[PDB]
Structure formats: structure tokens, C-alpha cells
């Protein structure tokens, strides 16, 4: 159906996302069990990590477009990522390495993430109709990798240990790099402008220097989440002031605040919803025993099933409003499952978590996938920067919100943890329903301003 480089990009993206989600799925449990963090420390540390992973994505588009070229930056990102995974594996011998290792994944992801999609859009003549379907298949690539990693990495880490899990993340990046090198012949005339001049060693060295400095800055911020909190607070207040000094822009600002709320909620899947599954859900579905950490795989699962359907089925403000209502219902469903449908022992049916993740995945399909592509219609570089900044702030806020469900290590009774989860998830659901309603109320004004 598609050009030959499409299949290359599809499989490279699949394997890189497999490595990343291999780490994401096990990381909070690794903090608690392997490093002995309390749940509170593990949740805010995960929030800082994810804030860096997501905020740094802006660097890689610039580096790919203007310094080194898209294809060279794919190679460099994949190598830094692989090194970061093998470093995380080595942190089990050398525990003092963990934060440097996570910084290396973050910087690596920052260099890599934007560039495969950019490459993909250059595989098609400019207004080729196959573009939409190819980008839907690209999203599905990401979620197939995510589904495999979130399903299997917890099982692997339990049977064989963490060093093996992280080294297989490493190995996934290595085979992504092998697939890319084997298929390089396919993209020889595809690239950004620096891809076709000789490589500038001055700029390559500047990129390496900046990368290493950022690896160390990330490590520091993740080890001291309070200064990271204040850094993002002053950066947000300040970038907000410089945005409020300099109509279709105000629309992008309200849509950004709504994206912020969405990502606060998305941040709960590896933290508070993960430990909710661990503590208060039956670990058996359809007669099979599973690792409860694997329940995270229900998000890519429902995306893979639902992204065809929803691709084959107002406009932007209403699509955002709908996504927000779906997220609200996901959390209200978790709360209702805990308030009314639990066993005498304090455990709930896994079908309720299946439904929670369905709602959350639908919200994802309506919001995060459809976000910056019609913020790219409302608009540039400053706004893209601020977009990733507020996304990072959302992950930091999400880690802080997760701490309200944190369980002390000595609690062993599910009837003690169930009400903590149900109070926090119920209040999240109600706040998010309120926000969805105010969004609905503002949809006509927003549509008129877009016009």
C-alpha cells in the first residue's frame, strides 16, 4: 500500500518505542523494590523523569532540521538511547549510576523522537492522499511496540531480573539501528537539507557537548525534584508572561491548558493506577494469572484496536471536549469500582480496569494525537517550546497528584488502601468533568475565533 521507506520507518519506530516502554512499565516498581524509595518518592521521581523525556522532544526537531540532518539525528538518537538502556542495566551493579542512566534515556529520546515522523512525511509527494492512513499506521506502530513492552517487560523483570529487562531494551534499540542501516538505500533522496551536505563536525561536537551537559542536568533534576518543581514554576510563569505580552493565539493557550490537564491524568497510568492494580484488583482475568504491572498494556491495546475505527469515523474544540469527557469517565469508573463493586477482602474485578483504560485510551485518541497538528493550524518556535514546557510541567504535576495515593510499605490490608484510591480517583474524575463542561461551554467562541 505504502512506499518502501514507510515499512522501514514503521519497524524502527516500533523497536524504539519497545525499548522506551520496557523501561516505563517497570520503572516505579524498580524505584520502590530495587532502590527502596517509598511510593511517594518513586512517584515524584517518575514524574521528573517523564517531564524531562517529554520536554526535551523539542531539541530533536531543531537538531534534525537545522544542524545534522534528520537521518543522522535518527542514528545519533538511537545510539544515545541504546547506551542509556545498557547503562540502566549496569546500574544494578553500580547503583549510583541510575540517575545518569535515566538522563541519558531522556536526552536520547529528546534527540530521536521528532525525527522518524518528519522522515515519514517526506516519503510521499506533498498532497498524496495516503498520508493520513500512513500516519495512523505510524501511531499503531508506536502502540504495538508499547503493547509488547508493557505486557512482557514486567514478566521478564520478575523471572530474570532488571539487568536482563533493561539490556533487552538496549537490544531493541540495537535492532532498530540495524534495520535502519540495512534499509538506508531506501531513503537516500529523503531528508532535511543538512542530510545532503557533508556533516559539520563543529555542529556535531556542539550537539555532543550539549547532550552530555543535559544528561548531567537531568540527573541532577531527577535527584532533587523540588528544585525541578521551582525551575518549571519560574519558567512557566515567565514564558507565560512573555506569551501574554506578545486571537488564534489565545485559542492555542486555552487548548494548551486543557492539554495540560489531559497529561496530568495520563501521568497516572505508570504510577497511581499501576499500584491500584497491584493492591486492589484481582490478578486473574479470563482464568489466566497475570502480573498486575502488565495491566498498563491495556492503554496501547485499546489504541491499537480503536485507531483504525476512529480514523474511519465540532471540529477541534469539540474533539478536545469529547476526549476530556472520556478521561473524566475513566477516573469516575475507577472510583465507582472501588466504592461499590469491591469484594469483602477489598479487591475489585479486572474488568473495571479494562473499562478505565478504554475510556483513557479514547481520550488519548481525541486529544493528544489531535493536539499540536491543529495548534500547527492556529499558528511558531516559541509556541512549540512552550508546548513542550507545559507538557513537562504536566508530568511533574502528575507525579505530585499521584503521591496522594501513596501507600506506606507496612500496610497489607486492601480495605485500608481502597478508600485512599477511591477518594483520589473520584476527585480527579469530578474535577475533570467540571473542566470538560467549561470546555463545552467555550466551544462556540473557540470555533468562531478559529474562523
Amino acid at each position: 500500500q505504502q512506499p518502501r521507506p514507510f515499512f522501514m520507518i514503521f519497524f524502527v519506530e516500533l523497536w524504539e518505542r519497545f525499548g522506551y516502554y520496557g523501561v516505563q512499565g517497570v520503572l516505579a516498581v524498580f524505584f520502590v523494590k530495587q532502590l527502596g524509595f517509598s511510593q511517594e518518592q518513586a512517584f515524584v521521581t517518575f514524574g521528573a523523569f517523564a517531564a524531562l523525556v517529554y520536554g526535551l522532544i523539542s531539541i530533536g526537531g531543531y537538531v534534525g532540521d537545522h544542524l545534522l540532518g534528520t537521518k543522522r539525528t535518527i542514528v545519533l538518537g538511537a545510539l544515545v538511547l541504546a547506551i542509556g538502556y545498557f547503562m540502566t542495566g549496569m546500574s544494578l551493579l553500580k547503583p549510583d549510576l541510575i540517575f545518569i542512566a535515566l538522563g541519558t534515556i531522556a536526552v536520547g529520546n529528546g534527540l530521536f523522537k521528532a525525527n522518524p515522523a518528519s522522515l515519514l512525511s517526506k516519503c510521499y509527494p506533498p498532497k498524496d492522499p495516503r498520508l493520513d492512513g500512513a500516519f495512523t499506521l505510524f501511531y499503531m506502530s508506536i502502540n504495538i511496540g508499547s503493547l509488547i513492552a508493557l505486557s512482557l517487560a514486567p514478566v521478564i523483570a520478575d523471572r530474570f531480573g532488571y539487568s536482563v529487562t533493561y539490556n533487552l531494551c538496549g537490544a531493541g534499540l540495537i535492532i532498530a539501528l540495524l534495520v535502519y542501516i540495512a534499509c538506508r538505500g531506501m531513503v537516500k533522496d529523503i531528508g532535511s537539507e543538512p542530510d545532503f551536505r557533508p556533516m559539520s563536525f563543529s555542529k556535531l561536537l556542539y550537539v555532543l557537548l550539549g547532550s552530555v551537559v543535559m544528561i548531567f542536568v537531568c540527573a541532577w533534576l531527577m535527584h532533587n525534584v523540588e528544585v525541578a518543581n521551582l525551575v518549571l514554576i519560574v519558567l512557566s510563569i515567565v514564558v507565560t508572561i512573555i506569551f501574554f505580552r506578545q486571537n488564534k493565539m489565545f485559542v492555542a493557550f486555552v487548548l494548551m491548558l486543557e492539554a495540560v490537564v489531559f497529561y496530568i491524568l495520563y501521568a497516572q497510568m505508570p504510577t497511581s493506577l499501576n499500584f491500584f492494580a497491584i493492591n486492589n484488583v484481582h490478578h486473574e482475568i479470563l482464568g489466566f494469572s497475570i502480573n498486575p504491572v502488565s495491566f498498563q498494556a491495556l492503554n496501547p491495546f485499546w489504541v491499537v484496536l480503536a485507531s483504525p475505527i476512529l480514523a474511519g469515523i465540532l471540529s477541534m474544540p469539540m474533539k478536545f471536549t469529547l476526549g476530556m469527557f472520556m478521561c473524566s469517565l475513566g477516573f469516575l469508573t475507577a472510583a465507582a469500582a472501588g466504592m461499590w463493586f469491591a469484594d469483602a477482602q477489598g479487591l475489585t474485578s479486572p474488568w473495571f480496569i479494562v473499562l478505565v483504560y478504554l475510556f483513557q485510551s479514547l481520550g488519548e485518541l481525541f486529544i493528544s494525537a489531535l493536539g499540536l497538528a491543529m495548534i500547527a493550524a492556529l499558528v511558531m518556535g516559541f509556541i512549540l517550546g512552550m508546548w513542550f514546557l507545559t507538557q513537562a510541567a504536566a508530568f511533574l504535576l502528575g507525579g505530585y497528584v499521584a503521591t496522594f495515593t501513596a501507600v506506606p510499605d507496612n500496610i497489607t490490608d486492601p480495605l485500608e488502601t481502597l478508600p485512599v484510591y477511591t477518594n483520589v480517583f473520584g476527585k480527579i474524575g469530578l474535577v475533570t468533568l467540571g473542566v470538560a463542561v467549561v470546555m463545552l461551554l467555550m466551544v462556540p467562541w473557540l470555533k468562531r475565533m478559529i474562523a
Partner: nanobody
Amino acid sequence: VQLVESGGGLVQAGGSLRLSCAASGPTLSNYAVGWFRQAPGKEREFVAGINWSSGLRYKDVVKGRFTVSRDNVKDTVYLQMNSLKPEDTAVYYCAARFGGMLPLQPSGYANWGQGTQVTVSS
């Protein structure tokens, strides 16, 4: 995923026994291990357990007599039973649940040992 219990047997009132539970491929260290017991003519009931981070839970009638503990190097969980009484007679099972929770009922646990007979004689 398969637990092996050892240590049962026959003892007189006021004596002591020590059960042990070991797992095979999965590392028991990620698991809360609960000890259940079934006396003749009754249901499996929760006796004692340790979660994955040293939290402990006990049935009221064994407090101050039984101690659960964990050797994370040998990957073993132990149940030390002192001041045994005749009504402690039962088949004892270890059960494993991923995480920090020790639910009271057998359905909260997916992995089960085969059971060891403990008999306490007057």
C-alpha cells in the same frame, strides 16, 4: 509460580515447628506470601503473612505465638510456630500474591503450594 512447602510434621502441645516456602523461576521477593491453614471440616483461613516490603499480617489467635519472616537471599519465607496447641492442627499452605497486599481470602492469591500436614498432640 510453584511454591514448595517444607517443615511440617507432628509435635506435642507447647512445642514448636518451622514451615518454609520457596518458589522456582519467579523471585519470591516481589510477592506477599500468606500462610493459610485448613483444619478437618473447615475452610482455608489466613494465618499469617509478609508482603514484599516487610509488612506483616496475623490472625488474632496466633499473635504472640507465630512469626512470619523472610530471607531474601535464600529467597525463602518462613513461618515459626511456637506454643503450638492442638487446635493448630491443619494442612498449612503457602500462597503468593504480587505486591504489598495480604488479602484474607484464598481468591486473593494465584500461586499455591501443595500443603503440609501439621499435627499438634495433647
